[PDB]
Every structure is written in structure tokens, then in C-alpha cells.
Amino acid sequence: QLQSAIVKAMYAATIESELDTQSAMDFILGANSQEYAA
Amino acid sequence: QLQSAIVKAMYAATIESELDTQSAMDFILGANSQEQYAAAPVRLGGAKVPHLMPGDSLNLQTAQDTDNGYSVFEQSLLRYIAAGLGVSYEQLS
Amino acid sequence: QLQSAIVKAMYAATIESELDTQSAMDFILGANSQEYAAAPVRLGGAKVPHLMPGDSLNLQTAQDTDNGYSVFEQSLLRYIAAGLGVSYEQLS
Amino acid sequence: TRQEELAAARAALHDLMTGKRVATVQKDGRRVEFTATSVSDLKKYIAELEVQTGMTQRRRGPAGFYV
Amino acid sequence: TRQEELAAARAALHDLMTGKRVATVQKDGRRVEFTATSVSDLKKYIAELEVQTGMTQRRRGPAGFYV
Amino acid sequence: TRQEELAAARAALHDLMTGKRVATVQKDGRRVEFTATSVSDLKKYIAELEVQTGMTQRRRGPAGFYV
Amino acid sequence: TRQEELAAARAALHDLMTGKRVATVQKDGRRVEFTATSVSDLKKYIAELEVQTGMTQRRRGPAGFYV
Amino acid sequence: TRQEELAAARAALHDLMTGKRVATVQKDGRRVEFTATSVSDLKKYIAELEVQTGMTQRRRGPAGFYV
Amino acid sequence: TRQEELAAARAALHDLMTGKRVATVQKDGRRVEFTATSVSDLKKYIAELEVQTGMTQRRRGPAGFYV
Amino acid sequence: TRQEELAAARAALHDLMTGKRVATVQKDGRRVEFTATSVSDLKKYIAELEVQTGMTQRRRGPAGFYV
Amino acid sequence: TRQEELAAARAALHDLMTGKRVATVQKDGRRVEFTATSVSDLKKYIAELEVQTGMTQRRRGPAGFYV
Amino acid sequence: TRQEELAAARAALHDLMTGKRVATVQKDGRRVEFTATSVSDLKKYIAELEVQTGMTQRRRGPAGFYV
Amino acid sequence: TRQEELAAARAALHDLMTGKRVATVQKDGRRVEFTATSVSDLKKYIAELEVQTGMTQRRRGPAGFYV
Amino acid sequence: TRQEELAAARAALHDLMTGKRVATVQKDGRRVEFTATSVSDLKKYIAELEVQTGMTQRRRGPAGFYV
Amino acid sequence: TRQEELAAARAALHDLMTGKRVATVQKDGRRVEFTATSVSDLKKYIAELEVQTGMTQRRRGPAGFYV
Amino acid sequence: DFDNLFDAAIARADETIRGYMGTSATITSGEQSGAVIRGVFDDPENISYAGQGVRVEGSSPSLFVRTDEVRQLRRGDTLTIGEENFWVDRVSPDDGGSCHLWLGRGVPPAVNRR
Amino acid sequence: DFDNLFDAAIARADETIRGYMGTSATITSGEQSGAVIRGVFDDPENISYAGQGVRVEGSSPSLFVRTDEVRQLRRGDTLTIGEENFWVDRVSPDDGGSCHLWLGRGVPPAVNRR
């Protein structure tokens, strides 16, 4: 039960788009690709 | 009821990609970085908001309350046997 | 009522897939098919699956196991208490 | 005959996917039509027969979690 | 005679799936069109008679949990 | 006459399922069309005719439980 | 042969996109009618064959947060 | 004429649900169209007609219970 | 003029239900088409005209209850 | 002059009800079409022109209660 | 000059609902048609022109209550 | 120039309302189609144009109350 | 040219509203079609265009209150 | 190549709005068909192009308040 | 080849929006049509390659907030 | 069976319509001699005037048999349709799955081969 | 290849129809000599009467194959539709993606050129 709470709480948000995965974070979730882990 | 409680809580979420499993979790959940099947464990970091495209989804099941009348129904049967055993209910339960 | 409570709880999840049921267990409920009572499943972590399109993982919410049954006994127990004369609270 | 069945259905998807599935063909006084199957349904059919045949693995069993 | 028509039904599914389910055919003043079914209805239909016949297992008695 | 009625329905199912139940036929000056019925309707009809007729058991009563 | 269809599909995507996806070409006494698919599922087919193709990276492992 | 019309209706239902509810008939220079009905309505018409007719038992008065 | 009216209407219901309500007729230049009704509306029309006519009781009052 | 259409419309209903409301008639270049009206609005038109005319009582003032 | 249109409207109402609002005519090269209005709006149209015309009261106002 | 179309539109409504709104007329080899609107929109069109025209009072500001 | 655009649009709205928006016109071998717009979009197409022009006050601001 | 195509598109809006958007144009044996687009998106293709061009402002930065 | 791909898309939007998306052509028996495409998806298609190609920045990221 | 994908499809087309339309044919004489063939019969009209008025109204029967079972029928052989008899005059070549049989009436006229 | 964006479309349709009906055949004699050609074969009817009556019912084969294979054919050369032999008589002009082939039957009649 404790493990389930972790994962269910862990994936907070989600974004979908036909755009590039790297590009989406740049234009949606701020990102720092201007300067492995996504 | 105890086993049903586990399983109903044992499956937190699901993913609905039409790709392969190995690519799906490497794009939606993470994992990979293997050493050299049992799929792949996922590190419990934080946040981890995934990018998606149409045709895929991440749905986490709400499951259901684990005591939907169980405890109160438990008391009733306990009262029943408690009278049968001739001992006070509060002592037995 | 207790017997009906058992069955409602005893079935928790369902698997819907045109795929063969053996592979369905393997790719959804973990399974250990590498090893006719179908197949057991080891209890572990979350094991989130990757069901293909056209599949489902419905979880049956069942229903309140005591949807008034205890209260209904209260009325019956009082009535039967009158028959035996002994006070209800002593009986119950 | 699964292996060629895999090839046939997979090719049947591709030509349909771009432009090349013939819904019907007409020569003067002699034409035939074929029921136009969907695209989603075929992929389930495509997905169905590949796993049941001797084709290699394409999906694994859920995914655990570790801290 | 279940098994042979079962294979024929399976064949018809394959024919229908890719391109071969002929809906209508036309000659000089001679045409006929057959009724067209869905795909899922056939899929459950073929599933119906494969279990009733003697072929191998495709269904297992639910699943239990051990720890 | 239920037995042959079932047999006709049995035939009328499989042929409809694959390709054979003809909606209509045209013969350049003479043509007739027949109303098309759902596959579900056949299965219901064939089942209820099957249970009422003299053939053996198909479906038993409700299932019980025991520990 | 992945690049063949991959290039063909994207070319078909562009072809279908502007004006050129022809569903039927008619010459006197010769009608050939192709089927047509939506843009979305067409992109889904695009979305699948390239990722299983060993081309450049196009996906990333979610997104973590740091204060 | 209860028995006669009931038997006629049952036969009509049988042929309709199998293959033979002639929607319209055309012979060059003439054509007629018989209207098409549903199947559930025909079945309930059959049921009410037979229960109205002097035939045997078909229904039972609910059901009781006993430990 | 109500008894023959109801008799004709019931016959019309029967023939429409079975096979025999022609909607459109045509004789190589002369054709007619009739508006088509439903089945439920026709049946309720039958019921109301029958209860209005001199035919005897058919529907009784509400049922009581006794221990 | 209210009973004439009362008879006419009522006769039209039965004409409409059974088979006879001609939707349209064509004769080799001479063809006219009549717009169709459903049975419901027809009957609910029958429902008032007779009550406003000298037709007998057909409605009663609610209903009382007494133990 | 409103009564005649009122008379025209109700006259148009009666024949339109029974059988006689011509949707279109045909004279082998000289054919026309008209837009078909529903019956609901027509009853509204006749109603609104009915009250505005010099005709007397038809619908009184509210309703009293007393013991 | 508000009076002319005010009368014209209202007359157009009445002509449309009964039977006379022609949508197309086909002389031999010469046909032309006029698209038609609804009636409520036309009715609204009647209301808005007349009030903006120097017409008399047709609406009253709310409504007072007195015991 | 906005002012005459209003005049053109206002005129186009009117004749369309009554009967005079031609959907299509055909002379033998020469037929053209015109897309028919809705009314509400056209009505607002009037609205935003005249307020855009120097036309006089058509709408005012929000209304206040005072005791 | 932005302002002039905007001017053409703006004219096209007016052309489509009133009566003149040619949908299908037919000559003897030769005819072509243009696709039909709704007004709103055409207005969108007008509106959003105004912002991205260097023309005059038509939007203001929200709206504050003050007692 | 993205730039010309983009350039073709640009004209594809503009010509389709105004009047020039040719649905079909007909050269007296030599006729062809094309599958119609929506406007949003085309904008979506023209959106994705715009940023995908080496074109300049067109959409920045989030938005800050300071008092 | 044949590199068409269409004829085999239309082969199914003819057998059902021949089942659904027309009757059986009881061929007599000829190399086939006693045999039964299914086909669709129709008898259109034809009036010839010859001289001033010599109207000789008759009919031209047709059968539309399937070519597989009517090979080497030849020409002089007759045929009984139900209760009445005819004699074949022309056998058309197959359209792909079947052909047309043109029937005379009464006895076949002589031979006149030599 | 074709400066019309339509010829490729219609020619591709020509590939489908020939592949979806009309069998395949091979050539005998002529420049092509042994070569396999797929088209669409059919045989209508044609009757001539000549004198008082000399009805000579025959056929009229046609192929409708794309032009590229059928180049340098001429007229004297023969061919066979599988088991049955024929011979080219007339080649229709290119439609745009194909052409029709008109066949005789049996041996081509002489030459009679010089």
C-alpha cells in the first residue's frame, strides 16, 4: 500500500504533443536544454 | 478480503502505448541503464512528469475503499460468536 | 450475506484481451510462465503493466459488505428478544 | 502459414496506410468491391498473430519499483 | 464437420482483413452483393467454435496469488 | 420441423458470417432484394430454437460455492 | 527496409497533406477507387515505424524537478 | 384463423431471419416493394399472438422461495 | 362503420408484420408510393379503436392485495 | 363546416394508418409529391377540432377521492 | 386584411396535414418544388395571427383558487 | 427604405408559411436553386426590422407589482 | 470601400432572408454552385463590420442602477 | 508576400459571405470542384494573420480597475 | 527539403482557405478527385515542421511572475 | 484456380443466381443425352411482317447455362424444359463463367450437312 | 517520369486492374517471341448473314495491355491465351497508359504484301 502511494503520487503531471520531446519541455515545462536525464 | 486488499492496491497505474514495453518505460517511466525477461525496475526519484504523444496514456486506477462495510460487518459476526461462546463481546474482540 | 460478501470480495480484477490467456497473464499479471491450475502470481510491488490497445484492466469495486445488514439485525434481534423475554442487549 | 500471413497482413497495412489499398476496381461492365476494413482493427489483428506465432518477444511483464 | 469450416472461417477472416472480402461483383447486367459483417463479430464468432471443438487450450482457470 | 429449422439456421449463420448471405441479385431485367438481419439476431434465434428443440443439454443451472 | 516505407509514408503524409492523395482515378470504362485513412492514424503509423527504426533519438525520459 | 395466421407469421419470421424477406422485386417494366419490419417487434407479435391463441402453457406465475 | 374498420386495420397490421404491406409500386411509367408508419403506433391505434368499439371488456382495473 | 374535415381527417387517418396515404404518384412525366405528416401530430390534430365542434363529451374534469 | 390570410393559413393547414400540400410538381421539363414547413410552426403561425386579428378572446388569463 | 421590405418580408413569410416558398424551378434545360432559411430566424428578422422602423409600440418595459 | 460593403452585405442578407439567395444555377451544360453561409454568422458579419466603420451609434455601454 | 494575400483573403471572406463563393463550376464535359471551408476558420485565418503582420494594433493588454 | 515542404504547405493553406483547394476535376471522362483534409490538422502539420525546421523562434517558454 | 481473383469470385456469382433464378433443364438426345442442367429461361418476343400482312409472331427462348456442364452440346440436339421441349440453335462462347443458349422450338430442322 | 501527376496515377490503376482480372498469356513468333504478357481477355459476339442466310457466328478477342510490352509487335505475329492460340490483327493507339489488342483465331491469313 505504501509503495502504491509513492508511484501514484510520483507521476504528478503529464503532457502530450506531436512536437519533439526535448522541444516540449522547452516550451511547456521551462526546461534548461539551452545549456540520459531528459 | 486481505488478499483482495493487496491486489486492488497492488496495481497502481497502467500505460497504453502501442510501442514495445522496453521502449515504453524508457520513454514514460524511465528505467533502462541496465548492466548486461523481468522488464526493468524503475528508480523512485521525484516528480518525473512524462512526455506523451496521441495514442498513449498513463492511467492510475483509483481502486476502492478497503473497508467498504468490512469492519462493521466484522463486529456483527463477532457479536454473534461472542454470545455463542458465552463470553463478553468486548473481551473477545 | 456473509457468503455473498466472500464472493464479491474474492473477485477483484478482470483481464480483457483477445490475446491467448496464457500470454495475457504473462504480460499483465507478472506471471512466472518460464516454469491445469493456470498460473500463480507472486505478490510484489506496483508492477505497472503495458497492456496493448484493445485491452483493459478493470478493477471491480464490489459494494458495501454491510449495507444495512447490521441495522437490520437490530430490528430482528429486538423482536426475537421479546419472544424469549430476555433483554435484547443481553442477547446481542 | 503464419510467417507469410505476417508478411501479407503487414504489407496490407502499409499499402493501405499510404494510398494503395483498392476499395473497388471497375472495368466497363465488370466491377467488384471489397469491404473497407478499418485501420485500428487491423493492428489488433496484426498484434494478435505475431505474438501467437513463433515471432520473437515484443513485450515484457509489467515493471517493478526500487528506491 | 466443425473443424474444416472453422479453418474456412479463419481463412475468410484473413481474406476479409487484408483485401479479399468481395462485397459485390458486377458483370454485364449480372450483379450480386453479399451481406457484409463486422470484424469483431467474426472474431468472437471464430472464437466461439474453436473452444467448442477439440483443439488445444486457449483459456485457463483465472489466476491465483501466492506469497 | 424444428431440427431442420435449426440446421437451416446453423447453415444460415456460417454462410452469413463469412461471405455467402447474398443481400440481392440482379439479372438485367429481373432482380430481388432481401432484408439483412443482424448477426446477433441469428445467434439469439438459433439459441432459443436450439434449447427448445430436442437436442441435448447446452447450458446448466447457476453455479454454487463451497470452501 | 525500414527507410523505404518511412520515406514513402512521410512522402505520402506530405502528399496527402496538401492536395495530392487521389482516392479515385477515372478513365472511360476504368474506375479504380482506393481507400483513404485519416491524418491522425497515418501519423500514428509514422509514429511507430520510425521509433522501432534505429534512427536518431526522438523521445526522452520524463522530466525531473530541482529547486 | 388464429392458428393459420400464427403459423404463417412464424414461417415468415423464419425465412426473414434466414435469408428470405423479399424487400423489393423488380422485373423489367415493373417493380414493387414490400415494407421491411424489425425482428424484435415480430418476435413480440408472435409471442402475444400465441399467448392469445388457445395453445399450451408458455409462462409461469413468478416464483416462490423456501429454505 | 367501426367493426369492418377494425377488422381491416388488424388485417393490415398482420400483413405488414409478416410480408405484405407494399410501399411502392411501379408499372413502367406509372408508379405510386405510400407513406409508411411504424408498428407500435399501428398497434396502439388498434388497441384504442378496439376499446372504443362495441367489443367487450379486454383490459380490467388495477389489482388489489390480500394477505 | 367543421364536421366535414372532422370526417375527412378521421378518414385520412385510417387511410394513412393502413396503407393508403399516397406519398407521391408519377405517370410518365406527370408526377406530384405530397409532404408527409407523422401519425402523432395528425392524431393530436384530431384531438381538438372535434372538441371545439359540437362533438359529444370526451373529457372529464380531473377526478375526486373518497375513503 | 388579416382574416383571409388566417383563413388561407388554416385552409393551408388542413389540406397540408391530410394529404394535399404539394411538395413538387413535374411536367417533363417544367417542374418546381417548394420548401416544406413543419406542423408545429404552422400552428404557432395561425395562433399568433389569430389573436392579433380582430377575433375575440380565446385564451383567458391565470386561474383563481378558493375554498 | 424600411417599409418596402418590411411588407415584403412579412408577405414572404406568409407565402413561405402556407405552401409557396419555391426553392428551385426547373424549366427544360434551365434550372436554378434558391437556398431557404428557417422560419424562426425569419420571424426574428421580422421583429428586429419593424422595431427599428418607426413602428408603434409593440413591447413594454418589464412589469410592476401592487398588492 | 467598407461603406458599400455594408450596403452590399445588408442587401445580400435581406434578399437571402426572403427568397433570393441562389444556391446554384444551371443552363444546359453550364452549371455553377455557390456555398451557402448560415444566417447567424452573416448577421454578425453585418455587426462587426458596421461598428468597425464610422456608422453611427448602434450599441451602447453597460447600464447602471440608482435608487 | 503577406499584406496582399491578406487583402485577397479579406476580399475572399466578403466574396464567400454574400453569394459568390463558387463551389462547383461545370462546363460541357469539363468541370472542377473547390473544397468548402467554414466561415469561422476563414475569419480565424484572417484574424490571427492581423496579429502576425505589421499592421495596426487591434488588441489591448487586458484591463485593470480602479475605484 | 523542409523549406520547400514548408513553402508548399504555406500555399496549401492559403489557396485552400480562399478558393483553390481543388476537390475534383473532370475532363469529359478523364476525371480525378482528391481526399479532403481538415484545416486544423493542416495548421497542426504546418505548425510542427515550422519549429522542427531551422526556422527562427516562434513560441517561447512559460511565463514568469514578479510583483 | 485461375490467375484472376475476379472470375473465381464471379464464378460464385453465377452459381447462386442460376440457383436463385430459372429452373432445371432436361436435355434429350445428343452426346450428353440424359442429363439435367440448371439455367434461367426467358422468352422475348419478335414479330415479322414479310409481305403486306404476314405477322408470324413467335419467340426466341434463352437459357444462360454454365459452360462447364454443357460442353460439346453441338447443335441438332433437342431439350425438354419442364413439360415442353425445345432444340438448341446457338451456343454462345463463355463470358468468363457461363454463356447463352439460343433455343428453337418444336423439332430441329433436318440436318443438311452433306 | 510523366509530366502530368496523373499518368502515374492512371497507369498504376492499369497495373491493378490487369493484376486483379484478365489472366496472363504468352507470345508465339514475332520479335518478342517467347514472352509472358498479362492483360484482360474477353470475347463478345458477332454474327453475319451474307446471302439468304449464312450465319457465321464468331468472336472478337481483346486484351487491353499496357503499351510498353506490346511494342514492336506488327500484325503477322501470333500468340496464345494459355491453351488457346490466336494472332494479333490490330493494335489500338495508346490510350495514355495502355492499348487494346485485337486478335484473330488460328493461323494468320497469308501475307499478300508484295
Coordinates of N, CA and C in Angstrom, one line a residue, chain E residues 20 22 25-28 30-32 34, chain P residues 5-6 9-10 12-13 16 64 95 98:
Chain E
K20 N -9.7 -9.0 -49.4 CA -10.3 -10.0 -50.3 C -11.8 -10.3 -50.0
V22 N -15.0 -9.9 -50.9 CA -15.7 -9.3 -52.0 C -17.1 -8.9 -51.6
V25 N -20.0 -8.0 -57.0 CA -19.3 -8.3 -58.2 C -20.3 -8.0 -59.3
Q26 N -19.8 -7.4 -60.4 CA -20.7 -6.9 -61.5 C -20.3 -7.4 -62.8
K27 N -21.2 -8.0 -63.6 CA -21.0 -8.4 -65.0 C -22.0 -7.6 -65.8
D28 N -22.0 -7.8 -67.1 CA -22.9 -7.1 -68.0 C -24.3 -7.5 -67.6
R30 N -25.3 -8.5 -64.8 CA -25.3 -9.5 -63.7 C -24.5 -9.0 -62.5
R31 N -25.2 -8.7 -61.4 CA -24.5 -8.3 -60.2 C -25.2 -9.0 -59.0
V32 N -24.4 -9.2 -58.0 CA -24.8 -9.7 -56.7 C -24.0 -9.1 -55.7
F34 N -23.2 -9.5 -51.5 CA -23.3 -10.3 -50.3 C -23.4 -9.4 -49.1
Chain P
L5 N -8.5 -13.7 -59.6 CA -9.1 -13.2 -58.3 C -10.5 -12.7 -58.6
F6 N -10.9 -12.5 -59.8 CA -12.2 -12.0 -60.2 C -13.1 -13.0 -60.8
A9 N -14.3 -15.3 -58.2 CA -15.3 -14.5 -57.5 C -16.6 -14.5 -58.2
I10 N -16.6 -14.2 -59.5 CA -17.8 -14.2 -60.3 C -18.3 -15.6 -60.6
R12 N -18.6 -17.8 -58.3 CA -19.6 -17.9 -57.2 C -20.9 -17.1 -57.6
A13 N -20.7 -16.0 -58.3 CA -21.8 -15.1 -58.7 C -22.8 -15.9 -59.6
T16 N -25.0 -19.0 -57.8 CA -26.1 -18.6 -56.9 C -27.3 -18.0 -57.7
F64 N -29.1 -19.4 -70.7 CA -27.9 -18.9 -69.9 C -27.4 -20.1 -69.0
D95 N -18.7 -16.0 -71.4 CA -18.4 -14.7 -71.0 C -17.3 -14.7 -70.0
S98 N -20.0 -18.5 -67.9 CA -21.2 -19.1 -68.4 C -21.4 -18.4 -69.8

